Write a protein that binds this ligand. Structure first.
Ligand code: PSF
Ligand code: PSF
Ligand code: CA
Ligand code: CA
Ligand code: CA
Ligand code: CA
Ligand code: CA
Ligand code: CA
Ligand code: CA
Ligand code: CA
Ligand code: CA
Length: 1533
């Protein structure tokens, strides 16, 4: 349907999202993982390439590969940072290839690739996978392609989740050009370009020497830097100097750091920093434009302008946080000229050149116009009392105008008169303005670029209305209001109407000649993009329905962020307005309002959102002091009227104020109606009464060491504060308290007071012993205003309770269920008000408090697991008190916790009045206490079940088609070296195909899960749930504890909440018994020994834990008392180990059920480092209805690779599942069929054993029934298949970032049942031994290297060098064919290359020490590549390299029949020669071209080699032996 709602349905407008901690400059743990896989087509002669990987300033190196232009590394690097996102995304990832690097000489560079971290982070999975970095010479614009480096680059923040692909076998002919390391839309060939950063002049610089300043401008771009000259002793410097960078276009480093700095001999320091975003000043595609900026001003912000010997906020001058003061304004320019690299006229140097720019006038930035800024401080409350009782001023400044202390007709009044604060409460002051509101007015002069601010105002007006609508949709989804899809269609209609309005509005004032090129280009880009946004919104409106509303709501966030991106004007016009609180002339706290928000326009859409309005500001501490413990308290709270505009437009600059004031003006302004006042004296005043219905809170912050709090809420309104009562030892208080703010005085008749009420600040505190209180959080509210003429009638009144999101810093700290109403005391006094019905404490009145219905809460008490020590004492007699809304039940005593942590009474219950609205249900508190002697109960831990919606019983859907249970439905269905790795790799390929299908048979398979097994079976919580007990104070979001180390135990059990008068037929269909209640089918609680068999397959992408960038992983398993540490079987120097292990641990379930599988880096000296660990919780797996004990294989077999692991046969599993589910069956008739309930399965009736005779069996059709157990009518359930799950490895020391992926699975077998056999042989495949024999027969047309000293005869002493594993382990040389005059050599020399080989990986396996000083042997896997080189032997100098070919033993070209048919096209990029594998044909003889790169970096034919490659196995080589060189057996001529 197309009908829609165009108005706000919910009350999200009354729940503001004010946060005192911004996201600007907040550091966060980041990790860049770069896997250098290989390189190809590297440009060099006999090069030993080393790939250097730099991220930021840290650089790491691969190992050196000898004499190859296509090296293979497969090396993993991890770079760790703790920086803000803007600093992080500006870091340069530089993947270089160098050679000849050693201990005192830096390497010669071959080629480099650059990008920044933000380009990788803007990818769909924050990563590139298997992409080729285009290397280029960074010092030569005329040089060509220097090679490619295949690599993975991934960026993760703390808490990000990446769908990382599994590393399968890489046996493919990979296309380099279709898989380049470039973002989408960047062309594969990138030109060179010059980035002219023209630096004209600066104004308004602060004091830096002690007292002049000597500024220069340093520009950073893509890792390069260049600076202008120093303009000594000038606050208005004039450079007219351009800094020219030579870099590739389009650049993958998309930000430029322009920074004015002061020149000192000792203390060269930053003044201000601006970042030019190249995304905002350019566009790609056909209708795009080159990056252009200016000539236009740019505003720089940073620390306070007063000079100190050391600066606390010097990081603000470097641009690392939000600037708290105006530093300077820099007149700026940017142009990009694409260089013609084929021209030999211009120089090919890439060095940063600082040249003289062409000077342009000041009138090019717009004519200077007079601007008038007016402020009216209506209210100044909530002032931090730690600043003292000294008098308080508020200084407003804009640029340097109004800065009478630090900055450098009408006289501007920039500060309020000083006024002593009065006490609101123990934490807060307020300034007693009352009727006398102090005012400020500032004259300033800025260039007239109001059109930029107007267009930004229209775009941000559309974005503001869009975000308000999407917040309305999200909130009314959360509160379950009817028809959320109708509101979203109205939001999209309103968005498309705003986008159409922008096109009609933004094309005014194009006749100004002061438009820059960027103004015209970004105007065209904004019109095009908002027209496409309007059409896309009209298209997305028709697709919004009931079931699709959440994903379309997600898709509208793209429109929102694109509007926020386009609304940011990169050419600054008017600097932001700063409001500073002062006492003893000390700058205490600041707010910063953008000047486009205050700008005045005739057009409503061009008008700023805060212009001519009373703006609620919250001042905050500058710099890092505004975060953490210091930034918790509200520094000040202002109701500041603000107006900015032209001085010609100030006729109506008082129109937004509340009416009923007299203007008191300065002495020079007497008798002038246009003169602004220095104060307003209000004569009208309206009496009001605020009712704070503080009913409840939930999920609050824990500010005591017991894990609880003593919360009371302090409600702030205007200058008054009132407290609720303190409720002890709870994180979900039911205060149930009405706070009445009597006879409030609202000065003046505020315009639209119903639609914009004054804000209410609610602060939660934990009461402590000595009168002090811990801050717990802060929410904001807006009251529902009743005017005097309004009736207190539905649907508006009485107000309903709603959840207000409490924030403690940036972290969420619970919800406050409250309602607020602001009732006007009318002409008839307080008799017009509604009546008011524990001492003087008033309850929340009827009609606002929730209507209560009776519920029964039944608790299953299953057990208590891993109860940690309290006060250094072991928990011995635990008891689980459960309390919900005052009522509750207590569990039976566990008389001895160690021998039996079971409850004697399984199911208890209690009755409690809960709200009829299930969204208003209070949380249920699980509390575990230890019963010491003499009634001394100490708290062990507590868990808060925040939502009971999961545990609410409703009668099940028996109208479902599965329940019908009647009518028959029929469901129908070399080799010897296959092992478990065959089915594993087949399942990996199948999982890859299913991941490709979700994005858009010879070998039996298992189910590889990309995540945990818990993620596919809702954590196995079908009947049994986990409730983590918590103790201790909740940690802060920076330098604090996470929730996991507050866990002091687990409570096992379930809940079942239902309304007390059940229907009798509903109760009987649920099978209600008096002993177990609603919990039917509960398994036995008795202890049972379980054999836990943990198969550890492999680990991928382990975090390095040694100084060499690798680790030595082994598996350490904890389960109960068993602590296996397999440090004898560590895999040395490997970050992607293949363990292939199994571990048998007998554990006493359900007590010893927390399984910890960890990976530890073995260290020779010192303790072994933890890499990561995972927790599996096998109890939920063991007792699940999903049968997560042993995985169910796809097919049944009794031999081979697909052998059935389970000691229970499929017929036994089917019989047990039918017996426990009370299903008739399994009825085996003939061996091919079985009937289970109404459903009939058919399949094969016979099974083959190891020797292949046939035997009739029921197991195939029983397994067919088990595979379709989900389709069973009564108790049908999806059984857990045979699987390999991928579990992330987590380190508590580096939280939030997954730093390994351990592929494993766990099989559990009860030991009262028959035991399983031996564990599966999942040990890694042994490499098949081979021997490659390479008979170098002859060489022809080898180039002549030597020149004779006497006659000048050209000759070569040709010998052939060959290896297969490497130069240092496998190299063999022929004897030298001395003095070849025509390039002909005769060798007949046989190489022998014995090697171990894995056929699936196509890798040669060898074991050798990494260095001569290394402790152990490391397993290496290289590609099978035979390298043949020709060399010239010299007696008195080094031998000279002549040419080489690298034959991949699976994909090398067929050798030519003669030497004349051998051409360069066999080895180069031509495809005309078919490829041949030596593992398939075993004998390839022919001629191959040997190539070398000349000084022009092109391949040339430097020789040909006749060779015979003969691949045999080792067993064939022993029975038919030959000798090395020409020796016996089988001698050569
Ligand atoms: C003197 C030569 C110093 C050479 C440099 C250096 O500090 O080496 C530390 C080495 C190796 O320790 P790790 O691999 O854990 O450090 C690596 C770390 N986990 C990381 O990955 O950052 O330890 C010792 O020498 C024994 C210390 C304890 C002795 C009781
Ligand atoms: C036993 C007495 C102390 C013996 C100390 C000793 O010599 O250890 C050998 C180590 C090398 O051993 P690994 O790198 O395999 O470290 C093993 C494992 N990967 C680990 O993490 O520790 O030598 C150096 O660190 C010096 C290199 C100098 C190069 C110039
Ligand atoms: Ca200086
Ligand atoms: Ca406390
Ligand atoms: Ca306390
Ligand atoms: Ca280590
Ligand atoms: Ca180690
Ligand atoms: Ca260590
Ligand atoms: Ca020579
Ligand atoms: Ca020679
Ligand atoms: Ca030589």
């Amino acid at each position: 349907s197309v009908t829609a709602l165009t108005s706000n349905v919910s009350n999200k407008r009354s729940k503001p999202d004010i946060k005192m901690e911004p996201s600007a400059g907040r550091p966060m743990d980041y990790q860049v993982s770069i896997t250098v896989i290989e390189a190809r087509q590297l440009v060099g002669l006999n090069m030993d390439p080393v790939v250097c990987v730099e991220v930021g300033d840290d650089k790491k190196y691969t190992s050196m590969k000898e004499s190859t232009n296509c090296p293979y590394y497969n090396e993993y690097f991890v770079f760790d940072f703790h920086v803000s996102p803007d600093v992080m995304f500006d870091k340069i990832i530089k993947i270089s290839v160098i050679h000849s690097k050693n201990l005192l000489r830096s390497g010669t560079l071959v080629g480099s690739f650059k990008m920044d971290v933000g380009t990788v982070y803007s990818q769909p999975e924050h990563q590139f996978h298997h992409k080729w970095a285009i290397l280029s010479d960074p010092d030569d614009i005329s040089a060509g392609l220097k090679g490619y480096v295949k690599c993975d680059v991934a960026v993760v923040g703390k808490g990000d989740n990446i769908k990382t692909p599994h590393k399968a076998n890489e046996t493919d002919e990979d296309d380099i050009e279709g898989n380049l390391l470039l973002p989408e839309g960047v062309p594969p060939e990138r030109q060179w370009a010059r980035f002219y950063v023209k630096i004209y002049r600066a104004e308004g610089l602060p004091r830096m020497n002690t007292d002049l300043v000597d500024p220069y401008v340093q520009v950073f771009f893509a890792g390069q830097k260049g600076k202008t000259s120093v303009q000594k002793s000038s606050y208005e410097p004039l450079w007219n100097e351009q800094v020219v960078f030579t870099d590739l276009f389009p650049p993958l480093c998309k930000r430029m750091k322009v920074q004015i700095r002061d020149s000192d001999k000792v203390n060269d320091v930053a003044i201000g920093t601006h970042f030019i975003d190249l995304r905002k000043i350019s566009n790609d595609g056909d209708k795009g434009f080159l990056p252009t900026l200016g000539p236009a001003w740019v505003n720089m912000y940073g620390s306070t302008r007063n000079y100190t010997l050391l600066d606390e906020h010097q990081d603000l001058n470097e641009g690392l946080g939000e600037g708290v003061s105006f530093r300077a304004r820099l007149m700026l320019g940017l142009a990009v000229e694409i260089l013609d690299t084929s021209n030999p006229e211009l120089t090919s140097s890439t060095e940063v050149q600082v040249e003289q720019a062409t000077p342009v006038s000041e009138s090019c930035t717009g004519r200077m116009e007079e601007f008038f800024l007016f402020g009216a401080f209506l209210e100044a409350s909530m002032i931090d009392r730690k600043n003292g009782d000294k008098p308080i001023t508020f200084e407003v400044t804009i640029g340097n105008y109004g800065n009478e202390v630090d900055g450098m007709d009408l006289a501007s009044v920039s500060s309020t008169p000083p006024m002593r604060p009065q006490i609101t409460d123990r934490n807060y002051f307020h300034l007693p303005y009352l009727e006398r509101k102090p005012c400020i007015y500032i004259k300033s002069w800025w260039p007239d670029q109001r059109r930029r601010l107007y267009n930004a105002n229209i775009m941000d007006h559309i974005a503001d209305k869009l975000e308000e609508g999407l917040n309305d949709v999200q909130e009314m989804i959360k509160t379950e209001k009817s028809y959320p899809e109708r509101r979203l269609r109205g939001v999209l209609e309103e968005l498309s109407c705003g986008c159409h309005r922008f096109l009609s509005l933004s094309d005014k004032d194009q006749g100004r000649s002061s438009r820059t090129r960027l103004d015209r280009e970004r105007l065209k880009s904004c019109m095009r993009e908002l027209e496409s946004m309007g059409q896309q919104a009209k298209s997305l409106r028709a697709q919004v329905k009931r079931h699709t509303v959440r994903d379309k709501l997600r898709s509208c966030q793209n429109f929102l962020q694109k509007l926020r991106f386009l609304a940011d004007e990169p050419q600054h016009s008017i600097p932001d307005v700063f409001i500073w609180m002062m006492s003893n002339n000390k700058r205490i706290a600041y707010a910063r309002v953008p000047s486009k928000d205050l700008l005045f326009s005739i057009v409503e859409e061009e008008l700023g959102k805060d212009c001519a309005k009373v703006k609620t500001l919250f001042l905050k501490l500058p710099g890092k002091r505004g975060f953490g413990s210091a930034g918790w308290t509200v520094q000040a709270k202002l109701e500041l009227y603000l107006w900015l505009g032209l001085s010609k437009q100030r006729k109506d600059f008082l129109c937004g104020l509340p009416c009923g004031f007299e203007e008191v003006k300065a002495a020079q302004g007497l008798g002038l109606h246009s003169f602004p006042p220095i104060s307003l004296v209000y004569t009208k005043k309206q009496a009001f009464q605020l009712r704070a219905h503080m009913y409840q809170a939930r999920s609050l912050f824990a500010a005591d060491s017991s894990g609880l709090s003593d919360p009371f809420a302090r409600v702030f309104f205007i200058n008054q504060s009132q407290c609720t009562e303190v409720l002890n030892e709870t994180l979900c208080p039911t205060w149930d308290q009405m706070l009445v703010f009597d006879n409030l005085e609202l000065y003046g008749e505020a315009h639209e007071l119903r639609d914009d009420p004054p804000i209410i600040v609610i602060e939660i505190y934990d009461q402590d012993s000595m009168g002090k209180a811990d801050f717990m959080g802060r929410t904001f509210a807006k009251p529902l205003v009743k005017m005097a003429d309004e009736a207190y009638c539905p649907p508006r009144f009485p107000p309903q309770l709603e959840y207000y999101q409490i924030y403690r810093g940036s972290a969420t700290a619970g919800d406050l269920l409250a309602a607020f109403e602001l009732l006007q005391i009318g002409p008839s006094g307080k008799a017009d008000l509604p009546p008011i019905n524990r001492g003087p404490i008033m309850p929340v009145p009827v009609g606002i408090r929730p209507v209560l219905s009776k519920y029964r809460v039944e608790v299953l008490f299953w057990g208590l697991r891993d109860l940690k020590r309290v006060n250094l004492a072991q928990v011995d007699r635990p008891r689980v008190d459960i309390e919900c809304a005052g009522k509750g039940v207590q569990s039976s005593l566990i008389h001895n916790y160690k021998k039996n942590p079971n409850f004697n009474t399984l199911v208890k219950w209690f009755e409690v009045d809960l709200p009829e609205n299930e969204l208003l249900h209070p949380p249920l508190n699980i509390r575990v206490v230890d019963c010491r002697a003499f009634g001394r109960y100490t708290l062990v831990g507590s868990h808060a079940v925040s939502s009971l919606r999961r545990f609410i019983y409703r009668p099940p859907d028996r109208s479902a088609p599965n329940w019908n249970t009647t009518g028959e439905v029929v469901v129908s269905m070399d080799e010897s070296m296959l092992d478990w790795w065959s089915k594993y790799f087949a399942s990996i390929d199948t999982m890859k195909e299913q991941l490709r299908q979700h994005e858009t048979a010879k070998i039996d398979e298992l189910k590889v899960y990309p995540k945990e097994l818990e993620s596919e079976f809702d954590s196995f919580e079908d009947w049994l749930h986990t409730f983590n007990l918590l103790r201790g104070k909740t940690g802060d979001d920076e330098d604090g504890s996470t929730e996991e180390e507050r866990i002091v135990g687990r409570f096992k059990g379930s809940l079942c909440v239902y309304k007390v008068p059940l229907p009798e037929d509903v109760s009987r269909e649920a099978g209600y018994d008096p002993t177990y209640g609603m919990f039917q089918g509960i398994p036995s609680n008795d202890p049972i020994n379980v054999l836990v068999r943990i198969y550890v397959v492999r680990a991928t992408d382990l975090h390095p834990a040694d100084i060499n960038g690798k680790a030595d992983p082994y598996i350490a398993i904890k389960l109960g008392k068993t602590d296996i540490r397999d440090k004898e079987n560590y895999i040395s120097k490997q970050l992607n180990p293949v363990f292939g292990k199994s571990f048998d641990i007998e554990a006493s379930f359900p007590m010893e059920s927390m399984l910890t599988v960890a990976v530890y880096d073995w260290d020779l000296v010192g303790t072994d480092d933890l890499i990561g660990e995972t927790k599996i919780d096998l109890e939920n797996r063991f007792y699940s209805k999903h049968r997560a004990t042993c995985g169910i294989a796809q097919t049944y077999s009794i031999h081979g690779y697909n052998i059935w692991r389970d000691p229970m046969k499929p017929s036994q599993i089917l019989t047990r599942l039918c017996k426990e589910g009370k299903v008739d069956g399994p009825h085996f008739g003939p061996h091919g069929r079985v009937r289970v309930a109404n459903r009939v399965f058919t399949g094969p009736s016979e099974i083959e054993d190891e020797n292949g005779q046939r035997k009739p069996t029921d197991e195939h059709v029983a397994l067919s029934a088990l595979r379709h157990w989900e389709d069973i009518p009564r108790v049908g359930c999806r059984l857990v298949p045979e699987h390999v799950e991928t579990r992330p490895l987590l380190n508590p020391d580096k939280p939030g970032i997954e730093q390994g992926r351990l592929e494993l699975w766990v099989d559990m077998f009860p030991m009262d049942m028959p035991a399983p056999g031996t564990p599966l042989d999942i040990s890694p495949r042994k490499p098949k031994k081979y021997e490659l024999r390479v008979i170098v027969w002859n060489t022809d047309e080898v180039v002549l290297e030597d020149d004779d000293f006497f006659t000048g005869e050209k000759s070569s002493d040709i010998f052939v060098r060959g290896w297969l594993k490497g130069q240092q382990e496998d190299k063999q040389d022929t004897d030298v064919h001395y003095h070849s005059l025509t390039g002909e050599g005769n060798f007949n020399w046989r190489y022998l290359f014995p090697f171990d080989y894995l056929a699936a990986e196509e890798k040669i396996v060898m074991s050798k020490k990494e260095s001569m000083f290394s402790w152990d042997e490391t397993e290496y896997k290289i590609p099978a590549r035979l390298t043949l080189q020709i060399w010239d032997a010299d007696h008195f100098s080094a031998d000279d390299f002549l040419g080489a070919i690298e034959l991949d033993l699976n994909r090398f070209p067929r050798g030519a029949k003669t030497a004349k048919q051998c051409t360069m096209e066999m080895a180069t990029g031509e495809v005309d020669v078919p490829l041949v594998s030596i593992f398939k044909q075993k004998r390839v003889k022919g001629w191959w071209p040997l190539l070398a790169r000349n000084e022009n970096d092109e391949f040339e034919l430097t020789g040909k080699v006749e060779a015979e490659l003969h691949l045999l196995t080792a067993e064939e080589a022993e029975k038919n032996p030959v000798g090395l060189a020409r020796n016996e057996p089988d001698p050569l001529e």
